[PDB]
């Protein structure tokens, strides 16, 4: 990719390799540990079907450069929505003002190294015709409406992004990525006797739109997801009041891995741990979870929404074991925090765009499978909840309190799943909740490709996963 991206981001904008040297040199006039130049161009499209018609379409373009100067704890940063030598010079000259003292000017020679390809460099926007894209949405509409007479409304959206990046740094890093991302989202409203409810489905990843027409367990993926949205809506329509209080909770496989994202994931980002503000600070080698739990953050997964062939600092994505048999092994890093902690980059240095600073961030965070069957797990509960789907979540990493809110849930009574219950927010302490995991299923899956993680106002595509698992005690925010 590097030559192709370089031609599009540098040569096409009047820039050469030697301009990179000049601008890095301008940063290195000051007493810095590190400086970098980050170049980006991106193209986004969206199309929306509603009321059985193609209501809307958009085409959105952005491009620019971001320049950082770093000394120990400190970062100077400036950027511009244009790729030009003047934009780079202006940005470097502002960013370097983070420190007044002169540096020795000794930068490392820029040199690219190979990394493993994790997704195609083919542009997903141009690889399918517009009418074929719209036919995906039309088929979702038809399938959802045919699935049940109570379906009254369907909103179906298709989005795609094609993004080129290149990063050059004072430590010699020179790297590029070509990043496709597509997403199909489906929302349905059902009505019966004046009562209404909604359901949703969807997913995607780093590939073209053909994925949505490919086979999923013997049906067309788009069709399967259209039916899933209806199924979710009908479950919710039938749901009764959820019970309140502390009880066993069995979480389904896949997206209920939001548990991990909140309970340990953010808490193991290296910025908080370098500062000492995370509950996990200084706990490497301690039991932070039950011995059945091994949690990884894995940036290497081919075609996945949350993967990073390189992170935004040029570090190739890695399989990082965070917790192994309950024992804390380490933290997700960016280059700044790794240096300060005496550790190494991990492939977790991510930024929303050129206009934002990178920080330690998740990629795909999941728990490894265990020995229990999901049926054995359900059968172990006398009274509790089974929650196979969630909305979102949130964590306070200092006090170690987190929440996540059900989108499909049921009572378990005498080892059987029984009545559907209404949405409830579940709350616990991260470490204490992970220590309550007494059974781990043999059915690991990741989410369908739906996640957006927020930290310090920066949204990123992130994945979660887990098998079915049992938390012995968790507080359920029902009314009953």
């Amino acid at each position: 990719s590097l030559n192709l991206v370089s031609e599009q981001l540098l040569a096409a904008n009047g820039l050469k390799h030697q301009d990179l040297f000049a601008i890095l040199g301008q940063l290195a006039e000051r007493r810095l540990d590190y400086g970098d130049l980050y170049f980006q161009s991106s193209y986004h499209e969206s199309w929306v079907l509603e009321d059985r018609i193609i209501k809307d379409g958009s085409y959105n373009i952005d491009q620019g450069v971001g320049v950082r100067a770093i000394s120990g704890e400190k970062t100077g940063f400036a950027y511009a929505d244009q790729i030009s030598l003047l934009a780079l010079e202006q940005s470097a000259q502002a960013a370097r003002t983070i420190v007044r003292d002169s540096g020795d000017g000794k930068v490392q020679t820029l040199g690219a190294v190979e990394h493993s390809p994790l997704y195609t460099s083919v542009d997903p926007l141009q690889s399918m015709s517009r009418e074929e894209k719209l036919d995906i949405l039309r088929r979702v509409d038809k399938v959802a409406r045919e699935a049940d007479k109570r379906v009254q409304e369907v909103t179906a959206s298709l989005s795609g992004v094609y993004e080129l990046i290149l990063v050059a740094a004072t430590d010699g890093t020179l790297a590029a990525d070509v990043r496709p991302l597509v997403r199909l989202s489906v929302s349905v409203l059902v009505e019966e006797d004046g009562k209404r409810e909604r359901g949703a489905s969807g997913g995607g990843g780093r590939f073209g739109y053909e994925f949505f027409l490919a086979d999923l367990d013997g049906e067309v993926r788009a069709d399967a997801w259209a039916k899933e949205a209806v199924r979710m809506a009908l479950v919710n329509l039938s749901a009764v009041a959820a019970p309140a209080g502390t009880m066993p909770v069995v979480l389904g496989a896949g997206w209920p891995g939001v548990l991990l994202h909140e309970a340990v994931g953010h808490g193991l980002e290296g910025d908080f741990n370098r500062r000492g503000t995370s509950v996990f600070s200084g706990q490497v080698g301690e039991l932070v979870a039950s011995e059945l739990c091994t949690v990884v953050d894995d940036g290497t997964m081919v075609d996945r929404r949350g993967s990073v062939a390189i992170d935004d600092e040029g570090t190739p994505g890695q399989y990082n074991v965070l917790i192994e048999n309950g024992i804390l092994k380490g933290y997700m890093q960016d280059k700044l925090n790794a240096r300060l902690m005496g550790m190494t980059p991990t492939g977790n240095g991510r930024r929303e765009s050129y206009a934002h600073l990178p920080m330690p961030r998740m990629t795909n965070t999941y728990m490894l499978p265990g020995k229990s069957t999901p049926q054995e797990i359900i059968e172990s509960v006398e009274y509790g909840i089974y929650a196979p789907n969630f909305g979102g979540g949130q964590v306070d990493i200092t006090s170690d309190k987190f929440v996540f809110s059900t989108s499909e849930a049921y009572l378990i009574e005498n080892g059987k799943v029984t009545k559907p219950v209404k949405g409830a927010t579940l709350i616990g302490s991260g470490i204490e909740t992970m220590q309550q995991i007494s059974m781990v299923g043999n059915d690991l899956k990741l989410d369908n490709g739906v996640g957006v993680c927020g930290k310090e106002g920066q949204s990123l595509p992130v994945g979660v996963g887990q098998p079915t698992l049992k938390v012995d005690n968790l507080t359920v925010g029902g009314t009953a």
Binding site: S58, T277, S399
Partner: protein, 445 residues
């Protein structure tokens, strides 16, 4: 001197809008163009020393076009004539493929703010990075020095930005305005008996001279942080709940989605059948004030160029209107109410009691000061959120609480509000005091 930079920017933006509209005009029945530019600085400190210095400059142009009632949109951060041309063409091309939708289109000419009011939103300051750093450092240091239990920090922060926005459409509207926002915060960590807690304080305003002092920010930060130490997890119970002012604003905030025209025409709101019904206490009025001078959410027109109006959204407990945009108004056979982009300063008067008096009235119950999670169903009103705050007994705060949830339904919560306090939160779009509810289900141990 910054006034000159802003006036140069404004001329450029006005010209970008006119160019885009002219390029659209021979090929569409209508078009709407919005452009903005925001510039400023964002700084942080750690232990009183500069940490981050970020120079911000963000620009943007969006266009929506209409032909045969088909819509297309496009956007670009590059405002060069050739980028604008490409953007206009992209929107036009999209509109060949979308379906006719008669509720879509430029807002009604009769509703447009052709001569938009000056709401005095622009109060620039030439704050240097070093000056910004010193304000952040002062706030953080005042927090850190407050008490020896404050053992770590998440820093001081200072932000100062100005913005220019211009909107035009094919009815001949072309209006723009400038605005500023400045803020100062600090956030520290306290520890007691192996429990760590974090909290923050802040000040915000359109003029620097409207801000609380750095020392005020730090003292408030420390006070809030220290108050969180050594919480208890309540047992599962039913009890009265006070939403402290800072979360009470959000309690009323859930109304916005429930009365939004988009939700109404889709029948996806639990208030679908509540227009003209008493949904709140008969003494409670929610006043919207879009033209407050210097207001934090004042606007001279909405995102479709529509005039904004003084309205009592709730009057003596009664829901008087929906919050409509052009599209949703047209779906309902109504006219836009100027709510494209949201609400514009809500005000709810107190009923005479201080926060202390409210604690005495409640006697025993939960004060919620922080909430976590979404947990609010737009379509049913079902409500379930994580909470932190304080347990109250004998009319006095006893201890902080955390790791609990509160649950109910918004229809019931709103209808049965006991009182609203005079302790008005004044830093937000929605401004009100603390709110007493007679009962919620609290899940805990």
């Amino acid at each position: 001197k910054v006034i000159s930079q802003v006036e140069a920017q404004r001329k450029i933006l006005e010209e970008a809008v006119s160019t885009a509209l002219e390029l659209a005009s021979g090929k569409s029945d209508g078009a709407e163009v919005a452009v903005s530019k925001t510039t400023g600085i964002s700084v942080s400190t750690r232990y009183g020393e500069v940490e981050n210095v970020e120079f911000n400059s963000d620009g943007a142009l969006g266009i929506t076009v209409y032909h045969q009632n088909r819509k297309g949109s496009a956007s670009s951060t590059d405002l060069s004539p050739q980028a604008i041309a490409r953007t206009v063409q992209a929107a036009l091309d999209i509109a060949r493929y979308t379906s006719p939708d008669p509720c879509a289109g430029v807002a009604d000419k009769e509703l447009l703010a052709f001569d938009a009011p000056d709401l005095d939103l622009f109060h620039p300051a030439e704050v240097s990075p070093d000056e910004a750093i010193e304000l952040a450092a002062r706030a953080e240091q005042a927090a850190l020095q407050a008490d020896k239990r404050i053992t770590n920090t998440e820093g001081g922060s200072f932000n100062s930005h100005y913005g220019v926005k211009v909107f035009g459409n094919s009815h001949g509207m072309l209006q723009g305005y400038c605005s500023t926002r400045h803020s100062l915060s600090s956030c520290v960590i306290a520890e007691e008996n192996g429990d760590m807690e974090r909290d923050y304080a802040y000040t915000i305003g359109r003029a620097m001279s409207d801000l609380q002092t750095p020392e005020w920010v730090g003292a408030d930060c420390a006070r809030r942080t220290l108050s969180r130490l050594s919480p208890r997890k309540l047992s599962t119970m039913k009890a009265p709940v006070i939403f402290a002012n800072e979360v009470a604003t959000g309690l009323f905030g859930h109304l916005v989605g429930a009365i939004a025209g988009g939700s109404v025409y889709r029948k996806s709101t639990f208030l679908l059948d509540s227009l003209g019904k008493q949904i709140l206490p008969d003494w409670l009025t929610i006043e919207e004030h879009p033209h407050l001078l210097k207001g934090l959410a004042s606007t001279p027109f909405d995102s479709e160029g529509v005039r904004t109006e003084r309205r009592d959204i709730i009057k003596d407990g009664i829901l008087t209107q929906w919050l409509l945009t052009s599209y949703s108004a047209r779906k309902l056979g109504l006219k836009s109410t100027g709510h494209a982009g949201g609400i514009h300063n809500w005000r709810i008067a107190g009923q005479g009691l201080s926060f202390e008096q409210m604690l005495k009235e409640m006697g025993t119950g939960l004060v919620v000061t922080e909430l976590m999670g979404q947990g609010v169903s737009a379509i049913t009103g079902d409500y379930s959120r994580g909470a932190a705050g304080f347990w109250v007994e004998n009319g006095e705060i006893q201890y902080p609480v955390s790791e609990i949830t509160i649950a109910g339904n918004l229809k019931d919560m709103w209808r049965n509000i006991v009182t609203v306090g005079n302790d008005i939160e004044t830093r937000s779009n929605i401004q009100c005091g603390s709110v007493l509810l007679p009962e919620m289900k609290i899940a805990g141990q």
